[PDB]
Amino acid sequence: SLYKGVYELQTLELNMETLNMTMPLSCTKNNSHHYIMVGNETGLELTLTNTSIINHKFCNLSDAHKKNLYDHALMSIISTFHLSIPNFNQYEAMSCDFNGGKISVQYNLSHCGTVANGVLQTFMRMAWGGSYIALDSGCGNWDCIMTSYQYLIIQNTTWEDHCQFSRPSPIGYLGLLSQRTRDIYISRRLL
Amino acid sequence: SLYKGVYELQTLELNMETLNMTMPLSCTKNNSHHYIMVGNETGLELTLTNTSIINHKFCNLSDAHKKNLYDHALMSIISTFHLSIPNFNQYEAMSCDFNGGKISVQYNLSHCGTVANGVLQTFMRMAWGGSYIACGNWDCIMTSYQYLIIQNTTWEDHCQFSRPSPIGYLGLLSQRTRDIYISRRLL
Amino acid sequence: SLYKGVYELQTLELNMETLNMTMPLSCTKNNSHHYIMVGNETGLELTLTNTSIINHKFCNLSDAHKKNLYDHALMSIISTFHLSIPNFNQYEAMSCDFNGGKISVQYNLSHCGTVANGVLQTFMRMAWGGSYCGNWDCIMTSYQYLIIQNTTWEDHCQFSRPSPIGYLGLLSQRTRDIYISRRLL
Amino acid sequence: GTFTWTLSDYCLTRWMLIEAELKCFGNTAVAKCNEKHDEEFCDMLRLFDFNKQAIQRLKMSIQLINKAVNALINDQLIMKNHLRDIMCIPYCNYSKYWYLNHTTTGRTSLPKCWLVSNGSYLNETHFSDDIEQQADNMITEM
Amino acid sequence: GTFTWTLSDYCLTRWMLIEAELKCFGNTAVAKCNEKHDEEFCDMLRLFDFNKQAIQRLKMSIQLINKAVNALINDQLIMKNHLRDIMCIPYCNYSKYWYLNHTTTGRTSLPKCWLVSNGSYLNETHFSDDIEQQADNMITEM
Amino acid sequence: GTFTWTLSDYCLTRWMLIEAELKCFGNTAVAKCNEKHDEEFCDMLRLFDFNKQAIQRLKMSIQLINKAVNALINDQLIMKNHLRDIMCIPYCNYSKYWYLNHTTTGRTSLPKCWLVSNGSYLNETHFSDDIEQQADNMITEM
Ligand SMILES: *[C@@H]1O[C@H](CO)[C@@H](O[C@@H]2O[C@H](CO)[C@@H](O[C@@H]3O[C@H](CO[C@H]4O[C@H](CO)[C@@H](O)[C@H](O)[C@@H]4O)[C@@H](O)[C@H](O[C@H]4O[C@H](CO)[C@@H](O)[C@H](O)[C@@H]4O)[C@@H]3O)[C@H](O)[C@H]2NC(C)=O)[C@H](O)[C@H]1NC(C)=O
Numbered sequence: 001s002l003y004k005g006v007y008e009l010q011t012l013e014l015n016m017e018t019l020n021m022t023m024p025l026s027c028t029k030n031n032s033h034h035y036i037m038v039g040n041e042t043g044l045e046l047t048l049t050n051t052s053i054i055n056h057k058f059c060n061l062s063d064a065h066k067k068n069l070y071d072h073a074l075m076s077i078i079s080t081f082h083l084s085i086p087n088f089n090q091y092e093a094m095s096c097d098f099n100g101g102k103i104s105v106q107y108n109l110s111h112c113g114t115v116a117n118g119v120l121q122t123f124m125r126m127a128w129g130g131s132y133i134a135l136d137s138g139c140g141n142w143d144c145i146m147t148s149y150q151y152l153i154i155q156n157t158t159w160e161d162h163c164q165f166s167r168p169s170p171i172g173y174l175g176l177l178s179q180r181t182r183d184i185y186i187s188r189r190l191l
Numbered sequence: 192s193l194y195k196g197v198y199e200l201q202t203l204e205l206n207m208e209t210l211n212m213t214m215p216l217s218c219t220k221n222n223s224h225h226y227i228m229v230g231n232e233t234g235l236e237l238t239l240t241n242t243s244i245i246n247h248k249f250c251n252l253s254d255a256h257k258k259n260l261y262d263h264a265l266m267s268i269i270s271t272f273h274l275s276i277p278n279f280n281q282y283e284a285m286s287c288d289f290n291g292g293k294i295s296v297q298y299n300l301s302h303c304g305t306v307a308n309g310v311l312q313t314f315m316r317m318a319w320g321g322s323y324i325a326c327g328n329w330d331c332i333m334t335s336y337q338y339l340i341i342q343n344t345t346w347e348d349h350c351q352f353s354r355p356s357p358i359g360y361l362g363l364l365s366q367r368t369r370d371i372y373i374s375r376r377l378l
Numbered sequence: 379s380l381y382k383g384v385y386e387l388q389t390l391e392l393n394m395e396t397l398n399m400t401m402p403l404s405c406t407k408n409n410s411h412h413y414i415m416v417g418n419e420t421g422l423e424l425t426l427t428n429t430s431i432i433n434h435k436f437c438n439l440s441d442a443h444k445k446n447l448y449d450h451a452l453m454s455i456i457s458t459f460h461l462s463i464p465n466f467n468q469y470e471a472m473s474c475d476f477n478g479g480k481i482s483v484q485y486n487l488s489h490c491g492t493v494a495n496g497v498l499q500t501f502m503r504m505a506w507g508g509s510y511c512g513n514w515d516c517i518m519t520s521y522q523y524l525i526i527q528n529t530t531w532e533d534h535c536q537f538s539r540p541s542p543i544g545y546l547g548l549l550s551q552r553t554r555d556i557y558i559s560r561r562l563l
Numbered sequence: 564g565t566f567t568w569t570l571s572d573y574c575l576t577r578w579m580l581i582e583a584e585l586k587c588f589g590n591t592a593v594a595k596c597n598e599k600h601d602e603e604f605c606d607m608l609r610l611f612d613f614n615k616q617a618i619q620r621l622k623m624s625i626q627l628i629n630k631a632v633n634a635l636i637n638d639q640l641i642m643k644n645h646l647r648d649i650m651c652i653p654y655c656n657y658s659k660y661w662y663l664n665h666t667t668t669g670r671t672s673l674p675k676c677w678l679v680s681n682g683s684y685l686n687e688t689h690f691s692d693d694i695e696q697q698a699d700n701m702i703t704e705m
Numbered sequence: 706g707t708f709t710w711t712l713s714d715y716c717l718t719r720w721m722l723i724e725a726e727l728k729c730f731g732n733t734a735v736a737k738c739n740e741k742h743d744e745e746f747c748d749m750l751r752l753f754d755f756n757k758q759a760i761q762r763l764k765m766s767i768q769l770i771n772k773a774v775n776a777l778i779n780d781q782l783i784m785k786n787h788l789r790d791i792m793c794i795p796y797c798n799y800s801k802y803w804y805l806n807h808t809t810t811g812r813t814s815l816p817k818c819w820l821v822s823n824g825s826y827l828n829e830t831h832f833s834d835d836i837e838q839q840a841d842n843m844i845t846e847m
Numbered sequence: 848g849t850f851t852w853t854l855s856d857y858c859l860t861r862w863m864l865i866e867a868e869l870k871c872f873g874n875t876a877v878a879k880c881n882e883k884h885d886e887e888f889c890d891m892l893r894l895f896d897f898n899k900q901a902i903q904r905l906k907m908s909i910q911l912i913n914k915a916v917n918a919l920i921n922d923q924l925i926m927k928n929h930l931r932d933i934m935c936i937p938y939c940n941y942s943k944y945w946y947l948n949h950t951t952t953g954r955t956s957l958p959k960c961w962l963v964s965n966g967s968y969l970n971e972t973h974f975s976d977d978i979e980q981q982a983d984n985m986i987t988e989m
Pocket residue numbers: 129130165166167168169656657658679682683684
C-alpha cells in the first residue's frame with residue numbers, strides 16, 4: 001500500500017461541469033447524439049440518424065453570413081469542425097440549412113478512404129470521451145472509420161441536461177482547434 | 192535602490208528602432224492614428240475617422256493581384272490584418288480602393304457582437320501603447336469613431352507619443368488564420 | 379582515436395529508407411530534378427525544365443475534386459506545396475491539367491522578386507538536399523518552368539540520400555504569408 | 564509555441580473539484596509546472612486559473628478561448644493521448660490524477676495521470692514502475 | 706512548436722539601448738535563455754541577434770521574419786501579455802527591464818521586464834516581492 | 848506545441864542503420880530528451896519510435912504524420928537548420944551524428960549532429976571546440 005513507508009498515495013478528481021461558461025464542453029448520450037455545450041444555456045446536437053431532414057443539395061452559406069440572424073459562437077464551433085475535417089474534397093455530400101438563424105448541417109456518409117472516414121474522425125475527436133460507442137471502427141483502425149448510421153446532423157439546441165453516458169469534457173474540442181486548416185485541399189489558384 | 196546591501200537595480204530601456212530593417216515597427220502618434228513603418232520605405236497608416244474616403248462597396252482585390260502594382264510588404268501586412276479579425280461575417284463592411292498599387296481600405300463601423308467589435312478588437316493589438324486610451328470589457332467593445340481607414344504613407348516622425356516596437360504585429364502572425372468562418376462549402 | 383582523455387570520437391549515421399512507410403521521402407538525383415516518394419509504390423516528380431508539357435492555362439480543380447479519380451496523398455502533397463508559397467499573386471502562373479487522376483501540374487517561372495522567387499523558395503525547402511548563398515530576395519533559377527507529376531516508384535535516386543525533413547518543414551508554414559483574395563473568407 | 568500562463572497563488576476547492584474539498588498544493592510542488600512541458604496537471608490548473616480570472620474580472624463569448632488555446636494549454640499532449648487511444652495503449656482522459664503524499668510535513672509530488680486501459684481505471688499493479696520512479700525520485704531532496 | 710534559436714556572440718551594444726551604454730551580461734546568466742520559456746528579455750534578445758545577423762551578412766521583405774518569428778520569440782508569450790493587458794492586472798511593455806547587479810564581483814541575474822499598468826510603471830513597490838525572490842535565487846547561485 | 852511523444856524502452860536496430868551492429872544507448876543518455884528543446888537526436892529517436900509503433904501496432908496515407916508533427920518534433924528546429932543553411936554557416940542534414948562512449952563503461956554523451964558545409968561534411972577542426980565543451984560538461988557530470 002504505502003511505498004517506502006512514509007509516502008502514501010492520494011488521488012485528485014476533477015469536476016469538468018464548472019467549465020461551461022469559459023469554454024465549450026462535450027458529452028455523450030443515447031449512443032448517437034453526443035451533445036455539446038457552448039455555454040450555460042444553448043449548444044449543438046451532433047446526432048447520427050438514418051433519417052434525412054435537408055433534402056436539398058444547397059447551403060446558401062454566404063446568404064447566412066449576410067443575414068446574420070444566427071448566433072456567432074455556434075457557427076464558430078461549426079467552422080472549427082469544418083476546417084478540422086482532414087482531406088475534405090466532395091461538396092455535394094454536406095447539405096446545410098442556416099435559414100432563420102438555425103444552425104443545421106447534414107454530412108452525408110454514404111473503399112474507406114472517403115469523406116465519411118474524415119468526418120467521423122473529426123466527430124470522435126470532438127466528442128473524445130464516449131465516442132467509441134458510435135464507431136464500429138476497431139482498435140488502431142484510423143484508416144477506415146465506419147458507422148451503421150448514414151448521416152451526421154449538427155443541430156442548434158437548448159441544453160436541458162443531456163449528459164447521460166459520459167461526463168462533461170472540453171478536451172476533444174480544445175485539442176481540435178489546432179487541426180483547423182491543417183489538412184485541407186486547395187480549391188482555387190489564388191486562394 | 193539598496194536591496195540586501197549588496198545589490199542594486201539598473202534599468203534597461205531598449206531602443207527599438209534597430210529592428211526597423213528586419214520586421215515592421217508599430218507607433219501611435221495620436222490617440223487614434225496608429226502607424227506601421229516597415230522601414231524608411233512607405234508604410235501603413237491606420238486611422239479612425241468619421242470622414243469617408245471610399246464611398247463605394249466594391250473591393251476589386253483579385254484585379255489588384257492581377258495588375259500587381261502594390262508593394263508586397265504592405266499587402267502582406269494588410270492581408271495579415273484582414274485575416275486576423277476574430278469573427279468576420281459581413282462582407283459589406285470592407286471596401287477597398289486599389290489603383291496603381293495604392294493601398295486604401297475602409298471598415299464601416301456602425302449593439303454588440305458585430306463586425307465593428309472584431310475589427311476594432313484586432314485594431315487595438317497593432318500596438319499596445321496608445322490604443323487603449325482610444326479594461327472592464329474587451330470582447331464586447333466599441334468606439335464612437337465611425338470608420339477605420341487604412342492607407343499607405345511615407346515615413347515621417349510619426350512616433351512622438353508611443354515608443355516604436357514590433358510586439359503587436361509579431362503577436363498577430365500566429366493569429367492570422369486562427370479564427371475564420373467558413374464562407375464556402377469546399378475551402 | 380582519443381580526443382580528450384579517455385573519450386573517443388565515434389559516429390553513427392541513420393538509415394532513412396527504413397522510414398519509407400509513414401511519410402514522404404525526398405531525393406535529388408541530378409542538378410535539376412528532385413523527387414518525392416510516398417512509400418515504395420508511387421511518388422511525385424518535381425522537374426525543372428525549359429519545355430512546357432501542358433499549354434492551356436486552365437486549372438479545373440473543383441472538377442478534379444468532384445471526379446475523385448486521384449490519389450489522396452499525392453494531391454495532398456501538392457496542396458501543401460501550393461499553399462506554402464510565400465506570396466502567390468499572379469494567379470495565372472499555375473497550370474494544373476487534372477484528368478483521370480493525372481497530377482501533371484505546372485508552374486510558370488517567367489528588378490526581381492516575382493512569383494518565381496517564391497516558387498523556387500518552396501522548391502528548395504521541399505527537396506532540401508541538392509537544391510543548389512547570400513541571395514534570398516531573388517533566387518531566380520535559370521530554368522523556365524517547374525512541373526509536378528505522379529510517377530510509379532523505382533530506383534529514381536542515388537545522388538542525394540532520402541529524407542523527410544524538407545516535407546516536415548513545409549508541412550508547417552502552410553498558411554503564412556498568403557495574400558487575401560476574397561473579401562470575406 | 565509553448566505554454567506561458569502563470570499559475571496564481573494553486574489550491575483548489577469544491578467549487579472546482581468533485582469530491583474532495585480544499586485540496587491545497589505546496590508552492591514548491593506546483594513550481595515544477597514552469598519547467599516541465601509534457602504533463603496534464605499543468606494544463607488543468609492553467610484552465611482553472613483563467614476560469615477564475617474570466618468569471619471574475621470580466622463580463623459566453625468563445626473568442627477569448629479561440630485565441631489563447633496554445634498559450635493556456637498544450638494541445639499536442641491532448642493529440643498524443645488521442646493517438647494513444649487509437650493505438651489502445653493506456654491513455655489519460657484528463658479525469659483522475661494520482662500523486663504521493665506524506666503527513667509528516669505534507670510534501671507532495673506534482674500529480675501525474677491515472678492512466679485508463681480497459682475503459683476502467685488501471686489498477687496500481689500495472690503502473691507500479693512509474694509510481695516507484697516518482698517515489699525514489701522524491702527521496703532526492705538533498 | 707517551441708522556439709529553438711540559439712543566440713550567437715551575450716554582450717549588449719550601445720545602439721540597441723536608448724541611453725548609449727556598454728551594457729554586458731555574463732554567459733552564466735544568459736545561458737538560462739536556452740532552457741527557460743516564459744522570459745521576455747530572452748525573446749527580445751533573440752530578435753535583436755536575428756536582426757543583427759540579417760542586417761549584417763544577408764542582403765525590405767517581410768516573409769523572412771514572418772516565417773522565422775517562432776524560432777526567435779514564443780508568440781504565446783505575446784498572447785499571455787495581451788491576456789494580462791485586457792484584465793486590469795499589470796502587463797509587460799517589453800520596453801523597460803530590470804535586474805540586480807552585484808557591483809563587487811560583477812555577476813548579474815537574468816533581467817525581467819518591468820511591468821506597466823495604466824500607462825505608468827510600478828515604482829518598486831507592487832513587485833518588490835518578485836525582486837526579493839530573484840535575490841534569493843541569486844543567493845542560491847552562491 | 849512541444850515534444851510530448853515519449854520514447855519506448857531505447858535501442859536502435861540493425862535495419863535502422865547502415866554499417867551498424869545494434870548500437871544502443873543508456874537510459875541516462877536519453878533521459879535529457881524529455882527536457883532538451885534543440886536536440887536533433889531526440890527528434891530522430893521520437894520519429895523512428897512512432898514509426899515502430901505505427902507498423903507494429905497501427906494497421907498508405909499521410910494523415911497520421913500530418914496530425915502528429917508538432918507533438919513529435921518541434922518544426923522550428925528544421926526551420927532553424929534551413930535558416931542556417933541560407934546564412935551560409937554550417938547547418939545540419941540530420942544524417943551523420945557523433946558521440947563519445949567512455950572506454951571503461953557504456954555511459955555515453957548525448958549525440959549532437961555532424962555539421963555540413965556547402966554539400967560537404969565539416970572538418971573535425973572547426974567544431975573541435977564544441978567537442979571540448981561537450982567533454983568538459985561530461986566530466987562535470989561525473
Ligand atoms: C475517463 O475514464 C474514466 C474511466 O472510464 C471515467 O470514469 C467513470 O466514468 C463512468 C461514466 O459512466 C462512471 O460511470 C457511472 O458512475 C456512476 C457512479 O457510480 C456509482 O454507482 C456505482 C455502481 O457500481 C458504484 O460502484 C459507485 O461507487 C457509485 O456509487 C454510476 O451511478 C453510473 O451507473 C448508474 O448510475 C447512472 C446514473 O444514476 C444510471 O443512469 C445507470 O443506469 C446506473 O444505475 C455509472 O456507472 C464511473 O463511475 C466513472 N468512474 C470509474 C469507475 O471509472 C471518467 O468519467 C472518464 N472521464 C472523461 C472526461 O472521459
